[model samples]
Target: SRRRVVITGMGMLSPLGLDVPSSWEGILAGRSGIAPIEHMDLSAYSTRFGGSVKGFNVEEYLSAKEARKLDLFIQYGLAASFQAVRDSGLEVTDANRERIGVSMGSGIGGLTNIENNCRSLFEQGPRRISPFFVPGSIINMVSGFLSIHLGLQGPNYALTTAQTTGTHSIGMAARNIAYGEADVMVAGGSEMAACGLGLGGFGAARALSTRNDEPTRASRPWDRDRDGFVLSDGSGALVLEELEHARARGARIYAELVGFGMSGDAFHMTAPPEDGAGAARCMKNALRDAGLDPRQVDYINAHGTSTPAGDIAEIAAVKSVFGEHAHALSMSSTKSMTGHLLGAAGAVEAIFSVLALRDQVAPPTINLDNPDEGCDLDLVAHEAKPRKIDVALSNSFGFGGTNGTLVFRRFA
Candidate 1:
């Protein structure tokens, strides 16, 4: 029989907060983390505001020398992973260190480091480029560095499926334990794409909002006035362990990860079909894997990034998968508060989903003053609401038409 997986610990850093508690409080209060981007030269950029991670001190997580060598994404990943490990109180003794692993990822890894190195190579010649450039900037380096720092000797890797990176990372990590590859896995994603190249690329694609006058109101998912997503920088990690392994150690279980599903649109490079066929299948597959009836699901953390097409498409998918339960069950886009964390979005949303089960309060979709057509679901709009959530699903749809869904159930 396959092994069971449970969430032993969770940690995150978002524009709303540097740690999980503060960020969760902000989300439940309908606070927006989006703000003007003063760190970058935005004089030539179309979108001037975003959800940048604030007050992240590298020294808090790494030595000054070590911090200088790794990129921001790697540093953020390590911080979140450290939090998760500490929260779990999982000691890495000689016997268990070989059974632990890591699976962290990023959508656009090390954009700042890459940009800086490219500039150095062109202006100051190859000799000026730092030797740490390659190791610091790669996507898998998060997992590599975390495993190295913690002395994990099991399977180690990273997934890079654009915005779906974190969801897939966690889901795949769960599979690693289920398949008897590892007893525990520190899994999630981190991202910091608010730099010049990050902003320039998304701006050029017209995928970002120019709500410079009011940054907080920019990421208005399912709202009529919504323009585009607010790019964000953050990280989220969860410590997933085999159920028996956790029980053996008396680990505090937050929730059980019951199922995971993935799909591809095959319809467009960046846009979902108006009907959201791919997304609907993704959710359906996850529910099936959990052996769950649609009515059993209580809440959803939508991948509602405020993009006009994505917001409505995800709603359409929800309606198709849940049918009448779509309106009955509560759903909300926490992205309205945290903006879009890209690869880290799904992991942070997964943390919120698990918290919703623990607290029985669905986070709000802020700035949704007016709902757009076809977005008629019970979106916990503008304010958090108390609900009896026994099961929750978090959705993540990425560029390249990739979609992933994670299912979690309140542990009895």
Candidate 2:
């Protein structure tokens, strides 16, 4: 029999707010974090707004000396991971240190450093490049650096599946504990790609909302006037442990990671099939993995990034899998507030889903003033609603047609 895996601790950093509590508060209030970009000069770019994390000081999470050598992506992941470890109170002793592991991911790694260092290479010759370039910008460095810092010696891993990175990371980490490879796992995702290249690339692809005049209202998921997703940055981490081990240590259990599903569209590279057949299958697989009937799920944290085709495709997928039960479920997109954090989205939204179960209230999909015709379901629009959600589903579909789903349940 497979060992049970449960989430014990979680941490978050986002444009909504600094830490977990503030972020959750902002989400529940149906607030938007989208704003004008101040970190860099966007005068030359088409998109002028994004969801940049505000009031985040690296020195608060890392030493001033140590912060100099790492990129914002790694720093964000470490900050969230350390908070998760501290929150879980899972003491890393010599005996169990070998059994602790980490699996964090970022879809695109170190865009800031990659652009600046390469600019130096072209403008000031190769000699001007910093020596910390390689270590600072690599995708795996988030997991690598955090493992060394936390003294985790087992199954150090990282994924880069665009928007699906976070969900996949958490899913795989749960499996690591379920299969007895580790007693505890630190799993989540992080992203900090708010540079000229990151923003310009998405804008060029027409995957970004250009409502610069009204930045706060840019990311309007499932709404008829929705344009595109707003780029954002942040990190989210969770501490997962075996059920028996958690019981032995008296660790507080948040929810069990009971189901995970993954799929490839095989139809398109940048877009999903309009029918959403691939995503529907992915959800079905997750429910199957959990051995659950569609009626058992009470809420869905949708992968609704506010894109024209993307939003409807996900809704169609939900209806297909859940059938008539889809109308009864409370579905919402917190991305309507936080914008799209890309790789970090899945982990952060997963935390929200667990909270929905704990708090007995569903977070709202804000800015849904005029939802589309097919999106006529109960979206918990504009305001958070109180509801008892026991089993919740979170969906994440990425650029390369990669799709992932995770299911969390009330730990009774």
Candidate 3:
């Protein structure tokens, strides 16, 4: 039998808000966090809209010297990890440090910093480049920095699986505990790609929304009017503990991570399979892992990125997994509000899914004024709704044809 795992703490630094509570409140209020990009000059980019983290003062979360040494993506991860460690209420003394671990991820690491340094080096010389450039731009350093800060000494690693990175990280972290490699794990995802090269590259691929005139509604997932995903940046973290460990410590149990599944789409590098076979396999495998039937799931936090093919393919995949129960499930894409956080999307959406199980309220899928015929499920559109949710599934599909699904069950 696998070891039981439960979420003890959660934290987020997102475009909707700076922390988990604020972000949850924003989601519950049906507010759209999407806006015109202000992180850098976007006048020249084809896509000028995204859900950029607003009002974040790096000095507020870290010392000036420390913040300067890290890139924006790592900074977000550290900030959220700080909050998660505080919320976990677990003491990490010298005795048990080796039994704790960290698994976090970032889709693209420090694109802005890389671009800046390259431009400086090209315009001037190597003398203009800072010594911290390499360490600051690496994706794995997000986990390295958090491990150093929190004194977690076991199994520190990072994932870079595009959008599925966060889900895969958490699932792999839970497996570490289930297999007795660790007692507790801090896991999540972070991304800060609302920069020049990041946006320009995604735009060049025609994967980003060019709806500059309607920034708020740019990420209209499952809607016929949808164009493409709006870029977003942020981080989310969660502390997972073995059930016996949590019970002995009398920690607050948020939800049980009952199942996780991963699959690959062999069809294309950036596009999903036309039949949605990969996605369906992931969802079905998660359900099987949880030892639950499809009808038992009450809500789905969809990977719906508001793209034409991705949305329809994901819906087809859901229908394939749930069958008749697909109609009974209430679904939503919080990405409609938070935009697409790339690798961090799964973690942030997982946070939302856990909250839905705890609060029994589903967040809205905004900008569903015109629905796509292919997406015929109940989208919980435009507004939050009260419901009794016992189980929820969060889906995340990445650009490399990677797919991941996680199922969380309410702790009775």
Candidate 4:
């Protein structure tokens, strides 16, 4: 029999807020974090709006010396991980160090750092590049830095699945504990891609909203006026422990990692299949993995990045999987508030999904003034609603047509 896996603690650093509590409060209140690009010059870019985290003081979580050496992406991950480890209440002394692990993911790692260092090298010389360049730019350093900071001596790994990175990390970490590879695993996703290349690449692909005038309302998921995703930066982390281990330690169990599914479209590199069959298969596989019927799910945190094609394709997939029961379930895309954090999207959205189960309220899909007729469903538009969400699903699909879903249920 497979060992049971449960979430004990959660943490986040999103454009909406710096930490979990503030972020959750913002989501519940239906607030938007989208704003003008203040970090860089957007004079030449088509899209000048994004969801950038405000007043993020990294020294609050790390020493000034330590913070200076790491990239912004790693700083986000470490800060979120610090919150999660402390929240988990897991005493990771020398004796139990080997039983704990770290598994974090970031889709595009440290683009800001790479851009800066390469610019310096090209203009000045090879010697002008900082020695921290490689360590800061690589994706796996999220786990490496986190482990060193937290003293986690067990299995350390990272995943880079673009948008699906967070869900993939969560699923992989849960499996690690479920299969007895580790007693505890810290899992989630993080990204800091607010740089020249980061903005230019997505903008070139026409995957970002170009509504530079009204930055706050640019990321209107599922709305007829929606153009594309508003790029954002942040991180979210969760503590997963074996069921019996958590109970023995008197940990507060938030929910169970019931199921996960992953699939590839094999059709397009950047766009999903128009029919959304691959997405449908991903959700169905997750239900099968969880040993639950489609009707058991009450809420869905869609990978609805506010993009026209992506939102419609995801809704079609949800309807295909849930059928008539789709209407009974409340679906919301918190991306309207948090924006799309690329690789970290699933992780933060998963945190939102788990919170919905905990608070028994589904967050709303803000900025839905005119809903697309084809994307008809209970999107919980504009305002949050009270609902007894016992089980929830979080969906994530990446640019490479990689798709993933995670199912969480009330820990009974």
Estimated TM-score for each candidate: 0.99, 0.99, 0.98, 0.98
Q: List the candidate 2 regions with Cα displacement exceeding 4 Å.
A: none
Count residue pairs with overlapping backbones in model 2: 0
Write candidate 1's Cα lDDT for 47-70 as tens digits. Answer: 888888889887988899999999
For 129-149, candidate 4 gives per-residue lDDT tens digits of 888788877888889988887
lDDT of 2 at 388: 79
Winning candidate number (lDDT): 1
Model 4 lDDT vs. the true structure? Answer: 0.90
What tens-digit string does per-residue lDDT give for candidate 2 at 360-395?
888999989998979888888999999878899999
Q: Candidate 1 regions off by >4 Å? A: none
Candidate 3 lDDT over 1-412, as tens digits, reads: 7899899999898989999999999999878888887646777889988888888877867789989888889999888877887898999999889999998899888897898899989999999998999998898887898788778898899999998988998888888998899999989999999888888999989999899998998899989989899989999999989999999989999999999999888788899986799999999888898899999999999998998988999889988888898989999999989999998999899999999999999899999998888778999889998998999999999988999999999997
TM-score, predicted candidate 4 vs. hidden true structure: 0.98
List per-prediction Cα lDDT, in the order shown.
0.93, 0.91, 0.90, 0.90
